[PDB]
């Protein structure tokens, strides 16, 4: 309920979210899940929903801790890799899309999430 | 068979009536049993609106311009904008607005009263989900409502391109007589009810292919009474069937011509192209909102 303010008023918002979850707090809700075919490429961050049979597609900005908390992004220019795009999240992790994006990395060669879809 | 459709459009038989204004016997708020798990009501609603818009003669230019009013939810996210971004061709200019702050996937997000939203550029498609809740007051008097509706009529008259289209949310109490009258300045219009929200008096007033002049004379007070009469006499069973097949969801890339024509050049053959959604009339200048 106050998870957004909790992270927004922390020196390290990503660490605050992790500590909040470790203390038993409920993950950030209202991540925008999209209706889709589930026959997409399976890539992590795409121009339109690209979920495969094992993923869910969400609106990018709703899954970004910095967009949701209305705070600066850790990028030098201040841009966001999720806003204006769609993020594919494994169905087993769809209960916490914001946490998934904070805890995971996109493979720079295949475009899939490392440890989930990345075959490289 | 109606259950498979994304929703129900007001039949022409009901549009041609001259009904007296009565109360609507439908309730808006209700435990929505057809929305799939994890899906927000607005994602299901806008999905079915875009599925219905896919059946219309929408002009789809290469560099399409879309403005979305009332895009923000109480949750601080923009689910309707997320569906519009999914439906529209990649790179379509999508700008959204709302009185209060929210997170959006639109290219531009405007915060503050809609009257404060100003642009010199014309749009190809206007979507509105604005609703009057602060005033609301259903009570007994169901008069034409001003507020955002007055700005919206002016916005369509000054900033909607010829050939352009609109989808504006209305309810039993949130409506405007001048908006219904303006529907007669389009090639075609309807009141569309989404199958997922069929128990509510809500509908989208959809105007297809704006002509910038009256084609029919609509009295707004009367047409709202006609809309209420249809809703009272035609119950619609809630349905989410159309949400289970998204294979043809994206708006077809038509590459609709955009021309800047003078009034003296807009003749019968040009009106005929506008009515078929084969033309958009406006400048192609840099957009500043
Ligand atoms: C979706 N439309 C409809 N329309 C106009 O209305 C007539 C009847 O069309 P209707 O939707 O009623 O369907 P059908 O022709 O099967 O007839 P019926 O249902 O039996 O009455 C049609 O001839 C058109 O001029 C129109 N006009 C522009 N510009 N754009 C549209 O998308 C539509
Ligand atoms: Na047109
Ligand atoms: Zn962000
Ligand atoms: Zn890889």
Number of neighbouring beta carbons within 10 Å of residue A95: 14
Q: Is A64 annotated as a binding residue?
A: yes
SS3 B12: helix
Number of neighbouring beta carbons within 10 Å of residue B113: 13
d(CA B238, CA B27): 13
d(CA A115, CA A105): 9
Resolution (A): 1.9
Shortest CA distance from A80: residue in chain B: B105
Number of neighbouring beta carbons within 10 Å of residue A38: 17
Q: Which residues of chain B does A79 touch, with a Cβ-Cβ cutoff of 8 Å?
A: none
Out of B124, B172, B178, B202, the active site residue is B202
d(CA A87, CA B8): 32
Out of B96, B129, B178, B275, the active site residue is B129
Contacts of A48 (CB under 8 A, 6+ apart): A86, B86, B90, B250
Q: Are B64 and B89 in contact (CB under 8 A)?
A: yes
Q: A8, A32, A85, A86: best mutation site toward chain B, by most B Cβ within 10 Å?
A: A32
- In sequence order, the β-bridge partners of residue A114 are none
The backbone torsions φ and ψ at residue B167, rounded to the nearest 5 degrees and listed phi first, read: -145, 110
Q: Is A107 annotated as a binding residue?
A: yes
Burial of B56 (0-12, 13-18, 19+ CB in 10 A): middle
Q: B40, B41, B82: best mutation site toward chain A, by most A Cβ within 10 Å?
A: B82
Contacts of A108 (CB under 8 A, 6+ apart): none
Contacts of B251 (CB under 8 A, 6+ apart): B50, B53, B54, B58, B60, B87, B88, B89
Q: Are B59 and B164 in contact (CB under 8 A)?
A: yes
CB contact under 8 A, A35 and B243: yes
The CATH number of domain B1-289 is 3.40.50.150: yes
Q: What distances in angstroms separate CA B233 from CA B10, B175, B227, one per listed residue?
A: 12, 20, 10
Q: Which residues of chain A does B36 touch, with a Cβ-Cβ cutoff of 8 Å?
A: 35
| B114 half-sphere exposure, CB direction, 13 A CA radius | 26
Q: Where are the domains of chain B?
A: 1-289
Q: Is A31 annotated as a binding residue?
A: no
CB contact under 8 A, A35 and B250: no
Please, which experimental method was used? X-ray
Cite the DSSP H helix spans in B111-189: 148-159, 177-183
Q: How many domains does chain A have?
A: 1
The backbone torsions φ and ψ at residue A3, rounded to the nearest 5 degrees and listed phi first, read: -55, -35
> Which residue among A35, A64, A83 places its CB closest to the CB of B43?
A35
Q: Is A63 annotated as a binding residue?
A: no
Ligand 1 and B131: CB distance under 6 A? no
Contacts of B272 (CB under 8 A, 6+ apart): none
d(CA A107, CA A120): 9
* Location of structure tokens 């490429």: A41
Describe chain B by its helix, strand, coil percentages, rounded to 5: 30, 20, 50
In degrees, rounded to 5, the angle at the alpha carbon of residue B151 between the alpha carbons of residues B267 and B279 is 25
Q: How far is the CA of B240 from the centre of ligand 1 (A)?
A: 24
Q: Which residues of chain A does B96 touch, with a Cβ-Cβ cutoff of 8 Å?
A: none
Pairing type for strands A55-59 and A86-90 reads antiparallel
Pairing type for strands A45-46 and B108-111 reads unpaired
d(CA B271, CA B162): 9
CA A44 to chain centre: 9
DSSP E strand boundaries for chain B: 7-9, 65-69, 93-98, 108-111, 123-128, 160-170, 186-194, 203-210, 257-259, 279-281
Ligand 1 and B275: CB distance under 6 A? yes
Ligand 1 and B211: CB distance under 6 A? no
d(CA B158, CA B122): 8
d(CA A37, CA A35): 7
Rg (CA), chain A: 14
Residue A43 tokens read as 């890539």
* Location of structure tokens 């809500």: B202
d(CA B76, CA B214): 39
Q: CA nearest A116: which of A81, A86, A92? A: A92
**Residues on A contacting B at a C-beta cutoff of 8 Å:** 29-37, 39, 47-49, 56, 59-62, 64, 67-68, 70, 83-86, 94
Q: How far is the CA of B73 from the centre of ligand 2 (A)?
A: 32
Q: What distances in angstroms separate CA A25 from CA A32, A66, B178, B265, one per listed residue?
A: 20, 18, 50, 65
Q: Which domain holds residue A71?
A: 1-120
Burial of B133 (0-12, 13-18, 19+ CB in 10 A): exposed
């Amino acid at each position: 309920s106050t998870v957004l303010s909790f992270c927004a008023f922390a020196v390290d918002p990503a660490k605050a979210y992790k500590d909040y979850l470790a203390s038993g707090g409920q993950p950030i809700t209202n991540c925008v899940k999209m209706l889709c075919t589930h026959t997409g490429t399976g890539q992590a961050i795409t121009v339109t929903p690209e979920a495969n049979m094992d993923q869910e597609s969400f609106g990018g900005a709703s899954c970004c801790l910095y967009c949701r908390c209305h705070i600066d992004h850790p990028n030098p220019k201040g841009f966001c890799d999720l806003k204006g795009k769609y993020v594919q999240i494994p169905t087993t992790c769809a209960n916490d899309p914001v946490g998934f994006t904070l805890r995971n990395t996109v493979c720079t060669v295949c475009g899939m999430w490392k440890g989930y879809g990345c075959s490289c | 068979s109606q259950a498979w459709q994304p929703g129900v459009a007001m039949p022409n038989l009901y549009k041609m009536q001259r009904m007296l204004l009565e109360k609507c016997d439908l309730q808006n708020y209700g435990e929505n049993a057809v929305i799939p798990k994890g899906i927000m009501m607005n994602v299901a609603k806008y999905t079915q609106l875009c599925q219905y818009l896919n059946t219309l003669t929408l002009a789809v230019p290469y560099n399409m311009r879309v403005i979305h009013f009332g895009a923000g939810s109480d949750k601080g996210v923009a689910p309707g904008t997320a569906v519009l971004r999914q439906w529209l061709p990649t790179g379509t200019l999508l700008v959204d607005s709302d009185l209060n702050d929210f997170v959006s996937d639109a290219d531009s997000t405007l915060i503050g009263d809609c009257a404060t939203v100003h642009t010199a550029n014309k749009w190809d498609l206007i979507i509105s989900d604005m609703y009057d809740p602060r005033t609301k007051h259903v009570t007994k008097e169901n008069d034409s409502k001003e507020g955002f509706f007055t700005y919206l009529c002016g916005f369509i008259k000054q900033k909607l391109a010829l050939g352009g289209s609109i989808a504006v949310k209305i309810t039993e109490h949130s409506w405007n007589a001048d908006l219904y009258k303006l529907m007669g300045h389009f090639s075609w219009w309807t009141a569309f009810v989404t199958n997922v929200n069929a128990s509510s008096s809500e509908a989208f007033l959809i105007g297809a292919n704006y002509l910038g002049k009256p084609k029919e004379q609509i009295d707004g007070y009367t047409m709202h009474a006609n809309y209420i009469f249809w809703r009272n006499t035609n119950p619609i069973q809630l349905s989410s069937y159309s949400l289970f097949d998204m294979s043809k969801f994206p708006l077809k890339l038509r590459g609709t011509a955009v021309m800047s024509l003078k009034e003296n050049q807009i003749n019968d053959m040009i009106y005929s192209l506008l009515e078929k959604g084969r033309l958009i009339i406006r400048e192609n200048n840099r957009v500043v909102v």
